[PDB]
């Protein structure tokens, strides 16, 4: 499907550290190379090295392998959003439930949206996941610490983006419409969703949902979606052919002072004229969700598997 800016990394030693880069286009480049997932693993699970060797982000595994949104290199996964500061992919704890369905065996990182957040599981050096996903057993094949991208599993068809916040009263309204669309559901990922006399054990649950920036997600059955292209600065990346992403200084200058190269859309809305070149990130645009008579621009929208208990009467 191809990357946004940067072709897949070819790392040299597992012990090289990863710099913090201030520039937007540089961060996008780290994301194309799964530098951010590598960093997550080093921070949380005693991992040494990198994931994404050669293939980069375009070669990661998705659990519904039929995945629409990865066909667009520019739509952001939860890990992608975490590197840009829009949300935190937390380390899993014992109460977080691994969903059945994915092929966990041999994965070194996986991540799923939960009802109230985003949760990830990583493996230490020389290890990879058992088939239940519950433990990391030894795996001599991962001993180099420079692992291919199919060891990274992203659960769900998910798109994340900058949101326009909504007041708390609007959230409580959306929460009410969700409760009436799913009367049969008691808990989702351990969070009370409806009041129930008696409940079944937790079951796999595929559902459409949106993150609108409050205490938990809004799950949805009947809803409409629409894409608007807005040509703001985050929709463009800046590079210099044969050298990778431009620096932070060069990028701000290209996007303020209209004095760099560009494609049609970047010149049309920003102005142009050795120098850097900026062009359009490949995506349908920003997603807007219509639910319960409202329109909302969520932080994340997607379809994805969670755990839920159903009512037994």
């Amino acid at each position: 499907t191809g990357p946004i800016i940067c072709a897949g990394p070819i790392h040299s030693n597992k012990s090289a550290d990863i710099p913090h880069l201030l520039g937007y286009s540089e961060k996008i480049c780290q994301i194309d190379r799964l530098i951010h997932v590598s960093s997550w693993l080093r921070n949380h699970s005693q991992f040494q090295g990198y994931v994404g060797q050669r293939g980069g982000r375009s070669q990661v595994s998705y659990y519904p392998a039929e995945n629409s949104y990865s066909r667009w290199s520019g739509l952001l996964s939860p890990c992608d959003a975490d590197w840009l500061g829009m949300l935190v992919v937390k380390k899993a704890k014992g109460s977080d439930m691994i969903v059945p369905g994915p092929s966990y065996k041999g994965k070194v990182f996986f991540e799923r949206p939960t009802f109230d957040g985003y949760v990830g599981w990583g493996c230490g050096s020389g290890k990879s996941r058992t088939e239940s996903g519950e433990l990391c057993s030894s795996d001599s094949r991962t001993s180099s610490g420079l692992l291919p991208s199919d060891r990274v599993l992203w659960i769900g068809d998910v798109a994340c983006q900058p949101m326009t916040p909504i007041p708390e009263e609007t959230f409580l309204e959306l929460k009410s419409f969700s409760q009436s669309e799913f009367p049969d559901i008691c808990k989702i990922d351990g969070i009370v969703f409806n009041q129930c006399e008696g409940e079944s054990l937790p079951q796999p649950f595929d559902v459409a949902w949106m993150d609108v920036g409050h205490s938990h997600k809004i799950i949805m059955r009947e809803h409409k979606t629409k894409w608007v292209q807005e040509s703001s600065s985050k929709d463009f990346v800046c590079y210099k052919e044969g050298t990778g992403p431009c620096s932070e200084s060069e990028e701000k200058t290209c996007k303020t002072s209209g004095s760099c190269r560009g494609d049609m859309q970047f010149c049309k809305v920003a102005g142009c004229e050795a120098k850097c070149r900026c062009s359009l990130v490949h995506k349908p645009g920003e997603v807007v969700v219509s639910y319960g008579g409202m329109r909302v621009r969520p932080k994340c929208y997607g379809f994805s598997r969670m755990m839920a208990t159903l009512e037994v009467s």
């Epitope: 949380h44 005693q46 380390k91 493996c123 239940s132 433990l135 990391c136 057993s137």
Partner: antibody, heavy 120, light 111 residues
Framework: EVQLQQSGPELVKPGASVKVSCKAS????????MYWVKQSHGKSLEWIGY????????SYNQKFKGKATLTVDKSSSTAFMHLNSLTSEDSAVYYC?????????????WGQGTSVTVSS | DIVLTQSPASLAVSLGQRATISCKAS??????????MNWYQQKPGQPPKLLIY???NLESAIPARFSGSGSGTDFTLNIHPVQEEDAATYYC?????????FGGGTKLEIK
């Protein structure tokens, strides 16, 4: 590297209390539960309790509920164990250990141990 | 609580020979394809050191003379070829449920 560092040996009088510390470094403190284990001299290892440093939630061995109290300080990466109403039956080496729930579900890093002698 | 019974309580093995230690649980510690059983080595004055987690996984930097096997309730720690540094007390420990429990331990002496 993960490392856990316990406070030094302790001499305390019967009926008194004692507080032991365990300082974690080399990883993000609130990611993993911290366990506490008792080992009387020559005897076997016994579980006392654990604490989730992210939110303070605790679980105790029934044998030590009311005897031991577990706390942490997030800002300084330290876990604490308070022992009260000391008798001679509380003299032992006490360990802290980090559990890697989704890696090995084992206690893969331990502190060096804190010797506690209860006598007058 | 899940009670763990180690045997023998004490065992003597000649250098270069094989040591075989047993642990029996009073209930299964298996769940969805893994066995939640760990083995620790403890020398006098030091903390336990993790050798084997989940029945058969060697912790990093543990020599391949150590191996573990078993499933459900019956587990084995093998040391072959036994060496001088292997003199210690070996503990099993189940991680299936709260409360964690430990076996009584097996002291390995060298002949």
């Amino acid at each position: 590297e993960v490392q856990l560092q316990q406070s030094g040996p302790e001499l305390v009088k019967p009926g008194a209390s004692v507080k032991v510390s365990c300082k974690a470094s080399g990883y993000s403190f609130s990611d993993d539960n911290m366990y506490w284990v008792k080992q009387s001299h020559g005897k076997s290892l016994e579980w006392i309790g654990y604490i989730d440093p992210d939110n303070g939630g605790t679980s105790y061995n029934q044998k030590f509920k009311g005897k031991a109290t577990l706390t942490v300080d997030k800002s300084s990466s330290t876990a604490f164990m308070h022992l009260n109403s000391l008798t001679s039956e509380d003299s032992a080496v006490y360990y802290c250990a980090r559990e890697d729930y989704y890696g090995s579900r084992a206690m893969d890093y331990w502190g060096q141990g804190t010797s506690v002698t209860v006598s007058s | 609580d899940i009670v763990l019974t180690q045997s023998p309580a004490s065992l003597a093995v000649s250098l270069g020979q094989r040591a075989t230690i047993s642990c029996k649980a009073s209930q299964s510690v298996d769940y969805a394809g893994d066995s939640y059983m760990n083995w620790y080595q403890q020398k006098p004055g030091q903390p336990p050191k993790l050798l084997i987690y989940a029945a058969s996984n060697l912790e990093s930097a543990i020599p391949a003379r150590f191996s573990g096997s078993g499933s459900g309730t019956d587990f084995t720690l093998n040391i072959h070829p036994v060496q001088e540094e292997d003199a210690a007390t070996y503990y099993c420990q189940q991680s299936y449920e709260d409360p964690r429990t430990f076996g009584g331990g097996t002291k390995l002496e060298i002949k």
